[PDB]
Write a protein that binds this ligand. Sequence first.
Ligand code: AGS
Ligand code: AGS
Lengths: 349, 352
Amino acid sequence: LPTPHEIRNHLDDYVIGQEQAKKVLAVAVYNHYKRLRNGDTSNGVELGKSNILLIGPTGSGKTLLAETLARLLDVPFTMADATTLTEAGYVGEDVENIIQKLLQKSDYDVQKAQRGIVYIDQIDKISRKSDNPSITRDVSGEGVQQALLKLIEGTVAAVPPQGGRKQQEFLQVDTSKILFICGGAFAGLDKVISHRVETGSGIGFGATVKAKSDKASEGELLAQVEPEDLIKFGLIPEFIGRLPVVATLNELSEEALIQILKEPKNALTKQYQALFNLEGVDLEFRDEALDAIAKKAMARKTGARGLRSIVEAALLDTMYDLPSMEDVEKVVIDESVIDGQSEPLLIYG
Amino acid sequence: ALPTPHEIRNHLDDYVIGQEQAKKVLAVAVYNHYKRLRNGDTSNGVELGKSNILLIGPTGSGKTLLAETLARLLDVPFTMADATTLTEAGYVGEDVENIIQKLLQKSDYDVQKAQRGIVYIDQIDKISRKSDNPSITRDVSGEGVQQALLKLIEGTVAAVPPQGGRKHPQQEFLQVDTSKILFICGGAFAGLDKVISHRVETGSGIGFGATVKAKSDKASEGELLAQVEPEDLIKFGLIPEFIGRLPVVATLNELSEEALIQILKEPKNALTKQYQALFNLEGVDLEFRDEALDAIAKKAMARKTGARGLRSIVEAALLDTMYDLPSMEDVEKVVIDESVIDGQSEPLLIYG
Ligand SMILES: Nc1ncnc2c1ncn2[C@@H]1O[C@H](COP(=O)(O)OP(=O)(O)OP(O)(O)=S)[C@@H](O)[C@H]1O
Ligand SMILES: Nc1ncnc2c1ncn2[C@@H]1O[C@H](COP(=O)(O)OP(=O)(O)OP(O)(O)=S)[C@@H](O)[C@H]1O
């Protein structure tokens, strides 16, 4: 009997600064369990299913949320990608590949698989290139979206169980109850949102001028997104209609990174702490060193994923002579070490 | 007795609202189909024709909804196939014959009982060549799939494996006549309004003599479909042969502002009744006043996504409420005012 507060508390341990995103998942997860729990033999018939669309900046933690969810989730979960999908039975891949991947996690249990959750990454890769209907067939893009429409609403797709032993049959897999979380970092969406959010004005004398968009306000700008803007970006309205809900993720700032290095249990700081714990050596991270990493992380425009480059670059010299070194019990990383002027202080004990 | 067009439509009215034109067309075909089968066919009139239906309507107008509601009341077997996965010449994707075997699963492998079944093919527009494309490579999911359905719709015998085959020992197929099978092929066509305008607008008019069309008040999209003809679809990509097999057409009359309000209250499967049951098990009931729904209708039409895009308006409001509702105790009723939809205020909570 999980609750949004309990599930959010668990997710909060691994994610920070995504209060709006977390609420959406908690409701769907809570409602999905509630929907399946219901016998369906009641006044409410064919209860609706709310899908989710996770849009956010690069490296903001979208892919991480789906991974952490599967650990806590009891029902099966699968994480596919739309990069390999090709329409019309081409050589690349078919959409049915997503369903068979779910059974691998579910051990080929049809009744248990229909109640599963699905996640897709890099959904923007199939958006039309800001054009009108094409003059030719776009195998990857407009074509792929057309195929997913019926899958999201609910239908049965042929799937060989285990790939087939040697049977010549396929197992029907309902999808009316399956939830879908399609999310990927869209590029350039702010420029499109800027045009629509801005009222617009005529350049002549009589036409009034409107002073707006003084600051980019990226995080606050994506919140004003609507389906009509995505149509101009390349998505088909049919595909978005299948995804009523949407999630806007703020971009992490200098202060957000500091909390990510200490509060989460799987933080990189704690990883190295365990790396040296087995070696009989302790590790420490002072606040002055984390402040400098934040400024360097933003300088590389890579997000949280670009943080390891800064850490490994500093501890490189240390890690080269640490195993051979003996009688060392503690390592401290100061602010100077990041700049490279100094070396990390080692204590012998 | 037999089901009547008026009686069958009343059943559909419970699940569909504002589609009087479409309901009648479907009722007649279903009644005609039952009539043709009921008839022995060994009479003066023979080789009776089958009138197929072609449903053209915008997204979320209720095309897919009609097929599901029909199968519930319909006694004969029904299937919901799609032309998106079909590939011609037996390629690796899928074959057109797959539609037939799916029908038998509902019919329990009864050939005589299967020919009288009904089929609904969605996403039919997605297999049309748009225009002026490279001819070095032939279309596999475009111009080449419609050709395969021509013989199927007109009536031919297609080999089908029985149950997929227990082992190689059988190595046999089943022959199923399809001349009697009905086909309802419909999908939301994109960009059809632009081609129809060229024929019925003739108003670029930059010269003195030519007129000006008074642009921004003539884009009557829904009404524009009402004047559709087969020649317009040829420019869209459909082959005349495929259209000849589908004489009937049914404009959908997509949506009226007031229709959306009726869909949320009168239907049994309305969204309002869904959430009402969602909280009913939790010992909580929520009411939606009419003053709140009028604002919701205006927000949905602004999104240009149809009824399917309506949940976005509801869940965006009730997000914070549903997140902190279980933790709350002694709460028996919730009221949602117009302000809640706007976001200025919060939904009032009642304590028992
Ligand atoms: N809030 C966060 N707290 C802790 N680690 C985070 C956070 N956000 C991102 N990360 C780190 O970023 C890694 C990858 O996050 P992702 O979910 O891939 O971000 P992303 O924006 O989804 O990148 P994409 O989807 O591949 S473009 C995780 O394994 C974490 O190490
Ligand atoms: N007349 C209607 N009355 C009630 N609900 C409707 C009506 N029309 C559409 N809906 C809602 O819209 C949902 C989907 O409608 P569809 O039948 O899928 O429309 P559609 O034309 O098939 O869209 P496509 O072709 O699948 S993109 C239904 O499940 C209903 O919730």
